Amino acid sequence: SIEKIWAREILDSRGNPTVEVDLYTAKGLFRAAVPSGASTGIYEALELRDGDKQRYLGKGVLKAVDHINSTIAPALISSGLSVVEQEKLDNLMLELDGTENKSKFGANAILGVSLAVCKAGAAERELPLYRHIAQLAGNSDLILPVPAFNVINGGSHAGNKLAMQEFMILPVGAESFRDAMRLGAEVYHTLKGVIKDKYGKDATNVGDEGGFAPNILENSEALELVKEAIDKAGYTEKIVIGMDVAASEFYRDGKYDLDFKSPTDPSRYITGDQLGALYQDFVRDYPVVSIEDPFDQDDWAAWSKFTANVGIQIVGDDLTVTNPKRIERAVEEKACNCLLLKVNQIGSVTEAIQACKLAQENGWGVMVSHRSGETEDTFIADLVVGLCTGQIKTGAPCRSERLAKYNQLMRIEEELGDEARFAGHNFRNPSVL
Amino acid sequence: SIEKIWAREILDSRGNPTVEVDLYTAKGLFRAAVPSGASTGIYEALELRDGDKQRYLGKGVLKAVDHINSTIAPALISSGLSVVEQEKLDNLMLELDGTENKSKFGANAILGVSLAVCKAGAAERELPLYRHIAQLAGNSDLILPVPAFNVINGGSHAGNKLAMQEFMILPVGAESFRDAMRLGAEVYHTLKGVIKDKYGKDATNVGDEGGFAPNILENSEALELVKEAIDKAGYTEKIVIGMDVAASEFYRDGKYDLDFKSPTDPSRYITGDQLGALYQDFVRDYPVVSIEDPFDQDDWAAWSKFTANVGIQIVGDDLTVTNPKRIERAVEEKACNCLLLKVNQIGSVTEAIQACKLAQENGWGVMVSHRSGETEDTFIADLVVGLCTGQIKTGAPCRSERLAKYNQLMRIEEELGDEARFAGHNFRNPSV
Ligand SMILES: [Mg+2]
Ligand SMILES: [Mg+2]
Ligand SMILES: [Mg+2]
């Protein structure tokens, strides 16, 4: 049972306030924290902010913390329920909120508490978090995921002209996860040199996700750099490329703009038909095997088209916003074959696990993801393992809000011993391993 | 007694390997990670690296990890010593190393254990970490430190012509530590807007410590930016500026090059006296209240002369390298009046605390420090509090390897309830 719940305001990796919760049980103290996004789809579970302009620019989260300490806490404590009952405790909060998008308490308030409970439940069962999570999702044989490092930030994640948002490297040819870390870290370091020597030292700083933010515009340039770093590191036959366009960030009047960070100019606009032609080039020119949000969150048409031709992975983000309703539609229209799992987009663990299953049962793939605004919390590490998704993207091997996850994953592999199995080339369908 | 010690190779905030230790006792598991400094002093303890230029660019630390699992672990365990015995345990490791700079096992291999022991000890004493540290140090009046956020970077920490390395903002006028975080964050966000409106969006990316590095040359321009961000954020009477010149980086043949990041041209080199005059102006025109490594680590004449001609805080880093011996000479020659405390620079908790008490004993100020290469570990957050140094620099308010420390400090303050104090304008001498 829950003894005491106490939330507070801490700062995420961007310097903005976020929710953190301490949940007490006879087993001990369990703490968790909520991440925050920069490029958020309109259909995302509401994130409740204070709006007090004279404090943190209105980004404060004192209201969400109050809802937790003064309302949610006594509610879950009275329930007498044990922290092991994730599904029950989560519903109680959903019902108490009473809104569809968690607009009364905020998805950040409910999620914080949900995460803390999961951790407490695992302890009550004397099992590591990833084990408890697997039991909740109904899994048995855990599997370490292939990491997708965003080594080159763009869009709203970094200061530069680059339209597209993320350019990732996936060590599918690694021997294990620990080895995958070495490959990604090594390629990343080489990449720093390639950029320094080609664009100068003043271009080796990093963006919100730890990726380098050079001063360029061409989306193919970023792809050439990554391809070079990989080859220069001697991993052409082991590391592939993935990317997140985040078209919704530059959607303007039924036209995708590859230069939104620059003064508005309708002259430099392309249609979804054009935008898709570019990907067909990227997929053939570079070892790209995955493309997230290649179109706008409401451009269902283009999506179903692209997926019908390409044989690679098409990840939905703002299109599905980890929401069963939006997913049902995409599954129906075959708009994509992969789901990006963002827990704070749905607002609770229970729904996130249910959202993952919905994807998997439909033959889709699942990539657990962080938010551009992260914290030292490492929950998603045990999450991706417990759900056996086989793939996670939680930043470049730079900035600890990212490394915290990757380090925890290497510990999980260590903890599994011989039972540790790397997804590898089966990152899309690890159920065969 | 220690039951088990298992070391592993994790990655730091820069993507480079480092040491992490798990220490098991009847009370559970205790983990700690060791940071890695960039511009390190040449006298500090030595960080052991594998040297395999093919693996992690020769930055692997598998060796240090083995020195722990294969040698240290069985040793400390077989001694049956309690984890509350920080000194006896640290010493036992120090002698097992033999060298006077922990080069046999690596300061990182030794510190990893030293930390995990301290955290375990605190659990043994049924006290929070910062309280245990206070008992080991012999302090009772806990106090929160004023945070020093590195907002603008230069020297060898970023890409630009900026000679001086760090430019920090200190919310000495905040109401509490929690409030100090708001002031710092807010100024930080304002600064990013200033740089965007003057140097362009392409100049708002962060460096290793979460700060910005706009392409500029004049160190005065850096000071000007910070001053504007502060005033525009509306905290002119509550936030001061801290400086970290890292002069050793541009010391050249007895002179100094404030443009050393541009093809060597010895015709611009300036003398220590000329440099100190520049500082004097900065202290006059800007709210500079603290300067770290204003001169080369071995330019004693300049340190002592400067310290005797100013009333601001003079911080020794590459000068003292958290080394008792080095500190003794600085004290005796009045080289500086504040010691930068870097735990990995000395190698052990006991020695680190030893170094801090020596400084404070001579009326010195003490500022706890992070390393350009940090981890999710927050030990130093509890350290600066238990040692009552009143000041700590552990990054700008960006990048979690920095926010991790700052958030811990806010918990600690919350944990201290009413009996909680904030150094405030007394960060130089909180002992008052
Ligand atoms: Mg987004
Ligand atoms: Mg996305
Ligand atoms: Mg320094």
Provide DSSP, B87-139.
HHHHHHHHHHH-SSSS-SS-HHHHHHHHHHHHHHHHHHTTS-HHHHHHHHHT-
Rounded CA-CA distance B432/B430 in Å is 5
| List of long-range contacts for A94-98, beta carbons under 8 Å, 24+ apart | A94/A348, A96/A71, A96/A72
Of B15, B160, B202, the CB nearest to A185: B15
The residue among B240, B217, B75, B237 whose CA lies nearest residue B169 is B240
The residue among A260, A407, A140 whose CA lies nearest residue B404 is A407
The residue among B169, B197, B204 whose CA lies nearest residue B397 is B169
- The Cβ-side half-sphere exposure at A300, using a 13 Å CA radius, reads 10
For residues B278 and B228, state if they share a domain: yes
| Cβ atoms of residues B129 and B30 within 8 Å | no
DSSP strands (E only) in B111-239: 146-147, 149-153, 166-170
Mutation for A interface: B24, B30, B202, most A CBs within 10 A: B202
Rounded CA-CA distance B268/A274 in Å is 55
For residues B122 and B162, state if they share a domain: no
For residues B164 and B113, state if they share a domain: no
Of B189, B201, B213, the CB nearest to A15: B189
For residues B207 and B254, state if they share a domain: yes
For residues A43 and A146, state if they share a domain: no
Of B374, B397, B407, the CB nearest to A400: B374
Residue type present at position A77: I
Q: At what angle do helices A324-333 and A300-309 cross, to 10 degrees?
A: 50
Rounded CA-CA distance A160/A155 in Å is 8
Give the CATH number of the domain where residue A81 resides. 3.30.390.10
| Chain B residue at shortest CA distance from A214 | B202
Interacting residues of B318 by C-beta distance below 8 A, sequence separation 6+: B39, B40, B41, B42, B246, B248, B293, B296, B297
Resolution in Å, one decimal, please.
Answer: 1.9
For residues B225 and B330, state if they share a domain: yes
* Spacing, Cα A420 to ligand 1 middle (Å): 31
| Chain A residue at shortest CA distance from B22 | A411
| Cβ atoms of residues B337 and B3 within 8 Å | no
3-state DSSP call for residue A326? helix
Give kind and range of the element (H or E) at residue A129.
helix A129-137
Rounded CA-CA distance B333/B299 in Å is 12
Tell me, yes or no, if B282 comes closer than 8 A to chain A by beta carbon.
Answer: no
Give the other-Cβ count within 10 Å of B141's Cβ: 10
3-state DSSP call for residue A412? helix
Evaluated on CA atoms B402, B403, B406, B411, the torsion sign reads negative
Among B68, B91, B126, residue at a domain's last position: B126
- The Cβ-side half-sphere exposure at A108, using a 13 Å CA radius, reads 30
CA distance B427 to chain A (A): 23
Of A202, A378, A403, the CB nearest to B160: A202
Residue type present at position B18: T
Interacting residues of B156 by C-beta distance below 8 A, sequence separation 6+: B38, B39, B165, B246, B249
DSSP B428: S
For residues B100 and B204, state if they share a domain: no
Rounded CA-CA distance A266/B342 in Å is 54
Evaluated on CA atoms A126, A132, A135, A140, the torsion sign reads negative
The residues pairing with B9 across neighbouring beta strands, listed in sequence order, are B19
The residues pairing with B166 across neighbouring beta strands, listed in sequence order, are B153, B244
Phi, psi dihedrals of residue A7, rounded to the nearest 5°: -105, 160
DSSP A267: G
Range(s) of the domain holding residue B415: 127-432
Provide the residue count of chain A.
433
| Cβ atoms of residues A193 and A252 within 8 Å | no
The residue among B210, B208, B227, B209 whose CA lies nearest residue B219 is B227
Among B70, B97, B126, residue at a domain's last position: B126
For residue A92, with 0-12 CB atoms within 10 Å meaning exposed, 13-18 middle and 19 or more buried, which class applies? middle
Size of interface A-B (CB pairs under 8 A): 132
Rounded CA-CA distance B340/B317 in Å is 5
B39 labeled binding residue? yes
Phi, psi dihedrals of residue B64, rounded to the nearest 5°: -55, -40
Tokens encoding A163: 């339209």
Rounded CA-CA distance A166/A162 in Å is 10
The residue among B92, B96, B68 whose CA lies nearest residue B80 is B92
The residue among B13, B53, B55, B57 whose CA lies nearest residue B36 is B13
Q: What share of chain A is helix, strand, coil (3-state, %, to 5)?
A: 45, 15, 40
A209 is a catalytic site residue = yes
DSSP A156: G
CA distance A328 to chain B (A): 36
| Cβ atoms of residues B411 and A31 within 8 Å | no
Give the other-Cβ count within 10 Å of B415's Cβ: 14
- DSSP states along B284-338: HHS-EEEEE--S-TT-HHHHHHHHHT--SEEEESTTTTT-HHHHHHHHHTT--SE
b/e per residue A354-373 (b: at least 16 CB within 10 A): bbbbbbbeeebbbbbbbbbb
The residues pairing with A153 across neighbouring beta strands, listed in sequence order, are A166
Rounded CA-CA distance A299/A247 in Å is 10
DSSP A262: S
Beta strands B166-170; B240-244: pairing state: antiparallel
Rounded CA-CA distance B152/B156 in Å is 12
The residues pairing with B341 across neighbouring beta strands, listed in sequence order, are B368
| List of chain A residues whose C-beta atoms are within 8 Å of the C-beta of residue B203 | 159
Tokens encoding B107: 């300061």
The residues pairing with B255 across neighbouring beta strands, listed in sequence order, are B252
Active-site residue set of B: 209, 342
| Cβ atoms of residues B127 and B382 within 8 Å | no
| Cβ atoms of residues B336 and B362 within 8 Å | no
Give kind and range of the element (H or E) at residue B348.
none
| List of chain A residues whose C-beta atoms are within 8 Å of the C-beta of residue B12 | 400, 403
Q: Which of A342, A351, A374, A401 is catalytic?
A: A342
Of A159, A200, A374, the CB nearest to B203: A159
Give the CATH number of the domain where residue B181 resides. 3.20.20.120
The residue among B338, B19, B369 whose CA lies nearest residue B165 is B369
3-state DSSP call for residue B206? strand
Tokens encoding A256: 């995708």
Say yes or no for a CB contact (<8 Å) between B407 and A202: no
Interacting residues of B295 by C-beta distance below 8 A, sequence separation 6+: B247, B251, B272, B275, B302, B303, B306, B319
Tell me, yes or no, if B411 comes closer than 8 A to chain A by beta carbon.
Answer: yes
Output the furthest CA–CA distance in chain A (Å, rounded): 64
Rounded CA-CA distance B153/A259 in Å is 29
* Spacing, Cα B265 to ligand 3 middle (Å): 25
Say yes or no for a CB contact (<8 Å) between A207 and B205: yes
Q: Rounded to the nearest 10 degrees, how much is the dihedral formed by the CA atoms of B75, B76, B81, B83?
A: 180
Tell me, yes or no, if A144 comes closer than 8 A to chain B by beta carbon.
Answer: no
Say yes or no for a CB contact (<8 Å) between A15 and B196: no
Q: Which of A44, A124, A186, A209 is catalytic?
A: A209
Rounded CA-CA distance B359/A368 in Å is 49
| Cβ atoms of residues A67 and A26 within 8 Å | no
Interacting residues of B340 by C-beta distance below 8 A, sequence separation 6+: B292, B315, B316, B317, B320, B322, B367, B369
Interacting residues of A355 by C-beta distance below 8 A, sequence separation 6+: A322, A323, A324, A327, A339, A341, A346
Phi, psi dihedrals of residue A284, rounded to the nearest 5°: -90, -30
Rounded CA-CA distance B333/A387 in Å is 63
At residue B135's C-alpha, the angle toward residues B131 and B137, to 5°, is 110
Integer CA distances (angstroms), A419 to A238, A412, B10, in order: 23, 11, 21
Mutation for B interface: A403, A413, A415, most B CBs within 10 A: A403
Which technique was used to obtain these atomic coordinates? X-ray
Say yes or no for a CB contact (<8 Å) between A410 and B10: yes
DSSP A337: S
Number of domains composing chain B: 2
Interacting residues of B121 by C-beta distance below 8 A, sequence separation 6+: B82, B83, B84, B85, B86, B132
Say yes or no for a CB contact (<8 Å) between A158 and B205: yes
Residue type present at position B170: L
Give the other-Cβ count within 10 Å of A267's Cβ: 5
Tell me, yes or no, if A375 comes closer than 8 A to chain B by beta carbon.
Answer: yes
Say yes or no for a CB contact (<8 Å) between A8 and B410: yes
Rounded CA-CA distance B284/A383 in Å is 55
3-state DSSP call for residue A153? strand
Distance of CA A132 to the CA centre of its chain: 21
For residues A139 and A63, state if they share a domain: no
Mutation for B interface: A4, A6, A12, A14, most B CBs within 10 A: A14
What Rg, from alpha-carbon coordinates, does chain A have?
21
For residues B111 and B161, state if they share a domain: no
Rounded CA-CA distance B88/B82 in Å is 9
Rounded CA-CA distance B397/A419 in Å is 40
Integer CA distances (angstroms), B229 to A207, B191, B196, B226, B240, in order: 21, 5, 12, 5, 12
What Rg, from alpha-carbon coordinates, does chain B have?
21
Say yes or no for a CB contact (<8 Å) between A186 and B401: no
Tokens encoding B381: 């957050």
3-state DSSP call for residue A104? coil
For residues A118 and A146, state if they share a domain: no
Phi, psi dihedrals of residue B55, rounded to the nearest 5°: -115, 110
3-state DSSP call for residue B154? coil
Residue B413 backbone class (left: φ over 0; alpha: ψ -120 to 50; beta: rest):
alpha
Tokens encoding B201: 């969006």
Residue A8 backbone class (left: φ over 0; alpha: ψ -120 to 50; beta: rest):
beta
Say yes or no for a CB contact (<8 Å) between B205 and A406: no
Give kind and range of the element (H or E) at residue B403.
helix B400-415
3-state DSSP call for residue A147? strand
* Spacing, Cα B339 to ligand 3 middle (Å): 11
Tell me, yes or no, if A399 comes closer than 8 A to chain B by beta carbon.
Answer: yes
The residue among A345, A341, A311, A316 whose CA lies nearest residue A330 is A316
Rounded CA-CA distance B252/A118 in Å is 58
Among B107, B126, B145, residue at a domain's last position: B126
CA distance A280 to chain B (A): 29
Give the other-Cβ count within 10 Å of B18's Cβ: 30
Rounded CA-CA distance A203/B218 in Å is 20
| Cβ atoms of residues B406 and B181 within 8 Å | yes
| Cβ atoms of residues A7 and A22 within 8 Å | yes
The residues pairing with B313 across neighbouring beta strands, listed in sequence order, are B290
For residues B112 and B208, state if they share a domain: no
- DSSP states along B18-87: EEEEEEEETTEEEEEE--B-SS--SSSPPPP----TTSGGGT--HHHHHIIIIIIHHHHHHTT--TT-HH
| List of chain A residues whose C-beta atoms are within 8 Å of the C-beta of residue B206 | 205-207
| List of chain B residues whose C-beta atoms are within 8 Å of the C-beta of residue A205 | 158-159, 205-207, 213
Of B201, B397, B400, the CB nearest to A159: B201
CA distance B221 to chain A (A): 17
Beta strands B391-393; B149-153: pairing state: unpaired
| Cβ atoms of residues A4 and A24 within 8 Å | yes
CA distance B369 to chain A (A): 17
Rounded CA-CA distance B367/B107 in Å is 21
For residues A61 and A196, state if they share a domain: no
Q: What share of chain B is helix, strand, coil (3-state, %, to 5)?
A: 40, 15, 40
Tell me, yes or no, if B14 comes closer than 8 A to chain A by beta carbon.
Answer: yes
Mutation for A interface: B151, B399, B409, B413, most A CBs within 10 A: B399
Give kind and range of the element (H or E) at residue B407.
helix B400-415
The residue among A346, A405, A408 whose CA lies nearest residue A370 is A405
Tokens encoding A375: 């914290």
Rounded CA-CA distance A213/A160 in Å is 7
B418 labeled binding residue? no
| List of chain B residues whose C-beta atoms are within 8 Å of the C-beta of residue A217 | none
Phi, psi dihedrals of residue A189, rounded to the nearest 5°: -60, -40
Ligand of minimum distance to the alpha carbon of B320:
3
A39 labeled binding residue? yes
* Spacing, Cα B375 to ligand 2 middle (Å): 26
Tokens encoding A179: 């080895």
B371 labeled binding residue? yes
Tell me, yes or no, if B213 comes closer than 8 A to chain A by beta carbon.
Answer: yes
- The Cβ-side half-sphere exposure at B105, using a 13 Å CA radius, reads 31
* Spacing, Cα A98 to ligand 3 middle (Å): 53
Integer CA distances (angstroms), A149 to A4, A210, A244, B59, B273, in order: 38, 9, 11, 20, 49
